[PDB]
Structures are given as C-alpha cells and as structure tokens.
Homo-oligomer: A and B are copies of this chain.
Amino acid sequence: EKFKFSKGDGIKFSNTTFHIYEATRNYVTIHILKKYATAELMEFMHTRHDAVYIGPILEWTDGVHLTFRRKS
C-alpha cells in the first residue's frame, strides 16, 4: 500500500516535484534535483512510502536518479 508507485508519476515534495523513473515491488528509482537528496526527502520517502535510500546516485542533465528499497 505505501510502497506503491507507477513509472512516470510525478510526486510533490517540498517546493519541487520528483518523478518515478522505475518502480517494482521492492525498489523505486526517482528523478530529483541533487540538492534535495538530504534528510527531508529521506523522511518523506520513509514515512509516506516505506522507502529507504540504497543508491547509487546517477547524474543526469536536469537532476539525479536515486534508488530506494522497500522497508515495510
């Protein structure tokens, strides 16, 4: 229920939006501006989505990919 995403979705966080690159039963990769890869995002992902950061962090032209694991 909490760890549920669909590829292509946009999610509001803080004063930005991150996008779902890939989502599976146990993993999710988001696209977000790198400066947001800090505690507030981690708390949001953990508390709202049962998701915890595992990496790696991959650089793209307008943001980074961050991969998270389901922690139910």
For A42-68 the 0/1 string (1 means CB < 8 A from B) is 110011000011111110000001110
With A and B bound together, what is the CA distance between A28 and B39 in angstroms? Answer: 5
Q: Is the interface of A mostly helix, strand, loop or mixed?
A: strand
For A9-29 the 0/1 string (1 means CB < 8 A from B) is 000000000000111111111
Q: Are B54 and A57 in contact (CB under 8 A)?
A: no
By a CB distance below 8 angstroms, the chain B residues around A56 are 37, 53, 55, 57, 66
- Nearest-Cβ distance from residue A63 to partner chain B, whole angstroms: 13
With A and B bound together, what is the CA distance between A47 and B70 in angstroms? Answer: 13
A and B contact pairs by CB, cutoff 8 A, 10 listed:
A21-B38, A24-B39, A25-B47, A26-B42, A27-B39, A27-B42, A28-B39, A42-B54, A52-B69, A56-B66
